[model samples]
Target: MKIALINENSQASKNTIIYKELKAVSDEKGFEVFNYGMYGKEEESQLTYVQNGLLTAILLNSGAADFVITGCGAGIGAMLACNSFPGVVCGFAADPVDAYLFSQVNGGNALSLPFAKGFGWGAELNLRYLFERLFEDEKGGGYPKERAVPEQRNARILSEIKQITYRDLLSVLKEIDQDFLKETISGEHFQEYFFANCQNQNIADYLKSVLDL
Candidate 1:
């Protein structure tokens, strides 16, 4: 699985910690990790939590990334924004257990976490443990064991309704500000990694035009 990590401005300073900790565990699970940036506060092409959603949507939909790890100061806004886009089911967590349960029940493709606010000394340990549990098992296994079938059902139902409620991803990309979309994808290594792995030609072609590739 290819996992893309996106860190918006508020918590951009912690990107390395987040990236390294995530890699430690995910690598063990044989998942590939890609760090898309805000790498620092002074990014020439900085992005907001809202843009985190946009980039997250683009990466996942285009098949450049199978999963996305993104968040801002509180994690809630990031989660909401990610879910705002179609084809991304996102969950948030500040702790290990919530991360574990969300993976089990929601079986989501994206996760948002608190990078500020509660971030303190020992935060690395928290992140390490959180990531460990987050990818511990095959997703949709249910929490109590007995709820597996029903939990899986609810996850599928939510996905179905989301498709009904949300517009096509490409259409939204077409409709939204072209400049904003370009800015969101302006990460230094974005095109390098994105186009190389992107499986959807239409999405790839659209981006190529936007980037003048």
Candidate 2:
């Protein structure tokens, strides 16, 4: 499967270990990695270009990317930009557990990591886990068995986590719509995209709430 590993130019120090280790594992797995350069961390001005390039690459590949991995000074910032588009759910994970759960639960299309997290080795395990296990849902037991150790356990845990995060994000969206954007256009836009991503139909309601305030 085609995979894209977006490397940031602005945060060279942060990506040293991440890209190298990711590269090694991806190569071994026989997956194609398209490395794109993000000029630096300049927020929307710079990030728009990077995400545009990423989207373009994915399209050119005919939406063939099994996954896209990215790394920079802070994984969250870059990922927040990428997830702006529809049909894209990118997770910024500092560890394999979060990465695995994010993929298993959300069918995450992208993954992000930061330098403070483990270097190449840490990243390799993250990538390897996702690439190797994404489609092979573990069910049953025994060697080559269905691997269905439990049905509802994993689902229940993931559902609880999602419930918490989704509600928290909804709160964030509500607060942003009402008060935060009064601070800046960037804040307003963040709210706009937040509503867009959450599939919330009450955007007009959100707007009214802000206006009333």
Candidate 3:
């Protein structure tokens, strides 16, 4: 599985903390992990939480990643932002327990974590538990094997609901503030990590138009 990690603003400083633990979990689990940053203070202005939603959408919709790990400082805004577009069903995970359930039950493609507010003590340990368990079960597998039939049904229905409820991604991208959209994609790695490896030629074309490249 390929995973994309996204971080915004105040918590951008913790990408190091976030990356090591998350990467270790996935790498040891035998998968690839990629990063999109607000790596430090300088990146904060360019990659706000909202902008990163755009990043999440493009990355997921265009098949650059199989799942996404993203977050904000105080709470659920990152989750909210990521879920705003098509192709990302994000869940809020405060601990390993919820993240694990979200894995087997919700089977979502994205996770939004709360990083700086109360993340200081025993943070790495908690994250270690959180990442491993979250990845332990296969995506969208049910909690109990027997009832998983309906449970998996619901997960898929919710995904369809997401698609029906959201506008076409290109439409949203075009209608939103051009400046905001531009800054969101302005991160240093866009060319190297995204545009080059994007799976959909149409998405790649649109991304090029957005970047005026």
Evaluate all candidate structures by whole-model CA lDDT and list the values in order. 0.91, 0.48, 0.82
**lDDT of model 1 at position 55:** 95
| Model 1, position 173: C-alpha lDDT score | 90
Best by TM-score: 1
Q: Model 2: per-residue lDDT, tens digit, 46-153? A: 333244334422322235355677756556666775554433567777655565556555555676666444545455566555444443443212221243234335
Residue clash pairs of candidate 2: 139-146, 139-147, 139-148, 140-147, 140-148
Question: Model 2 segments beyond 4 Å from truth?
Answer: 13-16, 38-64, 116-213
Pairwise lDDT winner, candidates 1 and 2: 1
Ranking of candidates on TM-score, top first: 1, 3, 2
lDDT comparison, 2 vs 3, better candidate: 3
Candidate 1 residue pairs that clash: none
Residue 164 in model 2: lDDT:
51
lDDT of 1 by residue, 1-213 (tens): 999999998888999989889999887889999999889846358899999999999999998999999999999888989999998989998899998999999899999999997999999899989888988898889988889999999999988898799999989999999999999999899989998999999999888898898
Cα-based lDDT at residue 12, candidate 3: 84
Task: Give the number of the best model, judged by lDDT.
Answer: 1
Relative to the true structure, candidate 2 reaches a TM of: 0.48
